[PDB]
Amino acid sequence: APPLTLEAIKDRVLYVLKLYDKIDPEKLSVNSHFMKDLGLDSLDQVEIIMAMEDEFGFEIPDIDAEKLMCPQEIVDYIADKKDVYE
C-alpha cells in the first residue's frame, strides 16, 4: 500500500471510534480521553483498543493496551510503530 500517513490512520481510527455508540458523534475530539473526556471504563477502553487491534492488522502490546487513551497519543504510537513519518 502507499505510505501510510498520520492523518490517514487518524481518519481510520476516528471513523472507528466515532462509529462506537458509546462515543456519540458530538463528544468525539482530538483530545478524547477514554475515562474522563468520554466516560468509558477500563474494560471499554480495552474493547476499543482491541477493535483497533483488529482493524489495523497490527497487534497492540499489552504495555500499551492498558495505557493508550487519547487519540493524539493513540495515533502517535501508530505513527512510531509503523514508521509513519511522511
Binding site: 474494560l43 480495552v46 474493547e47 487491534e53 492488522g57 493496551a65 509503523k82 514508521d83
Partner: protein, 172 residues
C-alpha cells in the same frame, strides 16, 4: 512492575475475548458473544474482598485456560504470526554505513553528509546526556527501568541514538 488486580483482569479480558474471536470465527457470533462476555465481566466488579476478587480471577483463568482456543489467532507481523521476524534478514545495523568504501560513500553523497551531521549530534549529545542521566539518576543505583528526559533545551534526550537510528519498520 507489580501486577495489580485491575491489570490481571484487563489481561484476562484481552485473552478471553481474543480467544473467543478465534472460537466463534464469524463476526456476528463474535459481537453477540463479546457483548455477553462484557456483561459477564462487568456484572460483578463490586467484589469488596480483594482475596475474593482474586479467587474469582482464579476461576476465570482456570476456565479460560481449559477452554482457550487450540489455535488462537495471531496477526502475522505480531509475535506469533507468519510475518513475525520475517524482515530481520533485511535490516542492517546503521554503523555498517561507516564502513562503505569511498566510492560507495560518494555514490550516496548527501545521505552520508546528513549522517555526518547526525553523528555530530550524537557526539555533542553524548556528554550532555550522560551528565543529564547522572544528575537525575536514582541516588545510589537506578530504581526503575524508565529512561531519563531532556528537561533542558537542545539536549538530545539520554539514550536516544539507537531508538532514533533504529532500523526502520520496513528496511527493504
Amino acid at each position: 512492575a507489580y501486577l495489580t488486580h485491575q491489570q490481571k483482569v484487563l489481561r484476562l479480558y484481552k485473552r478471553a475475548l481474543r480467544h473467543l474471536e478465534s472460537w466463534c470465527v464469524h463476526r456476528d457470533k463474535y459481537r453477540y458473544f463479546a457483548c455477553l462476555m462484557r456483561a459477564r465481566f462487568d456484572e460483578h466488579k463490586n467484589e469488596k474482598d480483594m482475596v475474593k476478587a482474586t479467587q474469582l480471577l482464579r476461576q476465570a483463568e482456570e476456565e479460560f485456560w481449559y477452554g482457550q482456543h487450540p489455535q488462537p489467532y495471531i496477526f502475522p507481523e505480531s509475535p506469533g504470526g507468519t510475518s513475525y521476524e520475517r524482515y530481520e534478514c533485511y535490516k542492517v545495523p546503521e554503523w555498517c554505513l561507516d564502513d562503505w568504501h569511498p566510492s560507495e560513500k560518494a555514490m550516496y553523497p548527501d545521505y552520508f553528509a546528513k549522517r555526518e551531521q547526525w553523528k555530530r549530534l550524537r557526539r555533542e549529545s553524548w556528554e550532555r546526556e550522560v551528565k543529564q542521566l547522572q544528575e537525575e539518576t536514582p541516588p545510589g543505583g537506578p530504581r526503575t527501568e524508565a529512561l531519563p528526559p531532556a528537561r533542558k533545551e537542545g539536549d538530545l534526550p539520554p539514550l536516544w541514538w539507537h531508538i532514533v537510528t533504529r532500523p526502520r519498520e520496513r528496511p527493504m
